[PDB]
C-alpha cells in the first residue's frame, strides 16, 4: 500500500526534531522538548539513526550528518568514565541513562547505568558504522570510534542471575534486581550482547530470556502472540533488525515471527479500540494505539459514573499484559506500527491528524499523546487541556520520535534494515541466538 504525502512530512518534522533539539557541542539529544531537562542516550541511539534519514531525503547535507555523527561519538568515547557517584557519564562501558545536557555526566544520583539504554544508543552506533562506509577520512573515523564504543561495553557484567542480563547499576546499591525477560522490547540488549568479540555472553542467555515468553503467549482480540500491552514493545528491536521470515527457535516451534507477532500485536490493540470495554473518548477503528508515553495527571476522577485512575508518564497498553489504560493515545504507537500493518495504520494516521492535528500535530510532528476524554478542571503534570477537546501534550518524546521516523523509512525503502543487515555483529549475535531462514539463510 502506497503512502500519501502527509507521511512524507511527518517523516520531515520527525527528523528535524533529532536534527534541532539535539545539543550540537556534543550530540546529546534530549529525554523529552521543550522541557528539555536532560539528555537521554536512547534518545542518541535514534538521534544517530535518524541523520543519515535526513540525508537520503535530502533534509541535511552528508557534510553536517558526519560532523554531527563525529561529535556525539567523540563525545562518548572520551567522556569521563569510572564508578564514581557523580562527575562520570558511564561505567564498564555503559552509561548513565540521563545526562546534563551541556556538561555530559550522570544527571543526579536517582539515575541507573541502564543496559537497554546503553543498547538503543549502540543500535545507533553501528547504524553509524554501516551507513557511513565512504573513503571520506572522517567516514572512516566514525566507522572506528563505533567500533570502540560497541567493543567496550561489558555485558558480561550485567549477568548478576545466570545467563540473564540486569536492568542496570547504581554505585549507591550495587545491580539493580530486575532482568530483562521476554517478553518486551529488548531483544536487542541481547542479541548486542550475543554479537559483541570483546564481551559477548553465550546462546544460553536468550533461551533464559525466552522461559518467561509462555506467560505472555495466548489470545486478545482475535489474535495469538506475544501480547505484551505496550506496542513499543513490538517495535523498538524491529527498528533495525528486520525480523520477517527468520525464525529462533520459539519461533520455528510456534511457526511464526517475530514480525507477525508485532502485526498481530496491531490489529489487536486496533479491535481493542474498536471494542473499547472501558468506553474512553474518541477510541475507534481509526482512533488507536497505547504504549508507554505522557498523560495528563497523577489522579482519579469520576468518569461515566465510575472511579477511574489516572497517571502522568506511565506504561500504557492493550493485551494480556502491562495494559494500564488512561483514555490516552500516543501517535507512536499506531504510527511506528506502519510496517507491520500499513492498510490500519495508514487510515489511523489520516484519521487523528485530520480530527486532532490543530493541536496534536505540531512543529517536530505528533506530540507525544493526547487524551479526548480528560476535560476535568485540576492542574496537570505537563500538556494542557483544549476546551471540550480534551488533553494533549506538550512535550514530544525521543524514544516515541525515534520509531515514528525509522518505521516510516522502513516502509518507503527498508532503509534502516538495509544498513543493519551488513553489521557482522548484529548478524553474529543473530545467528548465536539461534536465529535462521530469511536474510540470515546463507
Ligand atoms: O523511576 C525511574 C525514574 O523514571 C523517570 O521517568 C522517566 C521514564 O522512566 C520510566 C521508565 O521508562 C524507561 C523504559 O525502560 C526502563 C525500564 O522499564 C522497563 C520495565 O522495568 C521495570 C522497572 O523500570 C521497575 O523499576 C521495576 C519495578 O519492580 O519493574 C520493572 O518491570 O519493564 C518493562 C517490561 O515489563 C519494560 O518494557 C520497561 O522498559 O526500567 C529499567 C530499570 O530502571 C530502566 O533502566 C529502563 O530505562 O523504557 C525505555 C527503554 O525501552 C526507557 O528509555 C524509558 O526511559 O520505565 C519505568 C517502568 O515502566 C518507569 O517506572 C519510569 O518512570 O522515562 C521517560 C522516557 O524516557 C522519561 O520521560 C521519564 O522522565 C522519572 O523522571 C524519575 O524520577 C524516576 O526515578
Known amino acids: 500500500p502506497p503512502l500519501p504525502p502527509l507521511f512524507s512530512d511527518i517523516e520531515r518534522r520527525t527528523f528535524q526534531f533529532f536534527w534541532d533539539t539535539t545539543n550540537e557541542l556534543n550530540g546529546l539529544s534530549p529525554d523529552r522538548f521543550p522541557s528539555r531537562p536532560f539528555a537521554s542516550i536512547a534518545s542518541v541511539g535514534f538521534a544517530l539513526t535518524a541523520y543519515p534519514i535526513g540525508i537520503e531525503n535530502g533534509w541535511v547535507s552528508r557534510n553536517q550528518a558526519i560532523d554531527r555523527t563525529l561529535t556525539t561519538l567523540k563525545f562518548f568515547r572520551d567522556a569521563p ?12 562501558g555503559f552509561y548513565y541513562h540521563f545526562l546534563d545536557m551541556q556538561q555530559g555526566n550522570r544527571y543526579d544520583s536517582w539515575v541507573e547505568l541502564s543496559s537497554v539504554d546503553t543498547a538503543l544508543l549502540m543500535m545507533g552506533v553501528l547504524f553509524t558504522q554501516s551507513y557511513y562506509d565512504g573513503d571520506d577520512p572522517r567516514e572512516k573515523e566514525i566507522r572506528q570510534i563505533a567500533d570502540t564504543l560497541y567493543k567496550r561495553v561489558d555485558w558480561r557484567w550485567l549477568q548478576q542471575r545466570a545467563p540473564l542480563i540486569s536492568m542496570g547499576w547504581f554505585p549507591e546499591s550495587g545491580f539493580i534486581d530486575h532482568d530483562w525477560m521476554g517478553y518486551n522490547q529488548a531483544m536487542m540488549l541481547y542479541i548486542l550482547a550475543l554479537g559483541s568479540p570483546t564481551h559477548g555472553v553465550e546462546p544460553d542467555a536468550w533461551t533464559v530470556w525466552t522461559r518467561t515468553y509462555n ?16 506496542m513499543f514493545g513490538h517495535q523498538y528491536s524491529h527498528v533495525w533488525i528486520d525480523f520477517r521470515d527468520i525464525q529462533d527457535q520459539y519461533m520455528r516451534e510456534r511457526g511464526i515471527d517475530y514480525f507477525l507477532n508485532s502485526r498481530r500485536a496491531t490489529l489487536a490493540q486496533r479491535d ?8 474512553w473518548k474518541d477510541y475507534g477503528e481509526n482512533v488507536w494505539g497505547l504504549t508507554a508515553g505522557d498523560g495528563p495527571q497523577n489522579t482519579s476522577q469520576e468518569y461515566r459514573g465510575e472511579q477511574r485512575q489516572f497517571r502522568h508518564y506511565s506504561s500504557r497498553g492493550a493485551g494480556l499484559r502491562e495494559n494500564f489504560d488512561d483514555g490516552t493515545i500516543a501517535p507512536t504507537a499506531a504510527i511506528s506500527s506502519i510496517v ?41 503534570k505537563t500538556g494542557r487541556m483544549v476546551p471540550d477537546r480534551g488533553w494533549v501534550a506538550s512535550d514530544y518524546i525521543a524514544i516515541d520520535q525515534g520509531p515514528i521516523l525509522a518505521m516510516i523509512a522502513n516502509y ?11 553489521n557482522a555483529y548484529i548478524r553474529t549475535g543473530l545467528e548465536r541466538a539461534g536465529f535462521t531462514g530469511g536474510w540470515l539463510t546463507p
Open 340 to 380: 507491520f500493518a500499513p492498510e490500519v495504520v495508514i487510515p489511523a494516521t489520516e484519521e487523528m491528524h485530520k480530527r486532532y492535528g490543530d493541536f496534536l500535530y505540531s512543529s517536530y510532528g505528533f506530540l507525544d499523546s493526547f487524551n479526548p476524554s480528560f476535560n476535568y478542571d485540576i492542574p496537570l
Open 412 to 422: 518507503q525503502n527498508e532503509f534502516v534494515w538495509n544498513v543493519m543487515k551488513k
Open 272 to 279: 481493542y479500540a474498536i471494542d473499547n470495554p472501558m468506553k
Open 81 to 92: 568514565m569510572g564508578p564514581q557517584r557523580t562527575g562520570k557519564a558511564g561505567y564498564k
Open 215 to 230: 506467560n505472555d503467549w495466548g489470545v486478545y482480540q482475535g489474535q495469538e502472540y506475544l501480547s505484551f500491552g505496550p
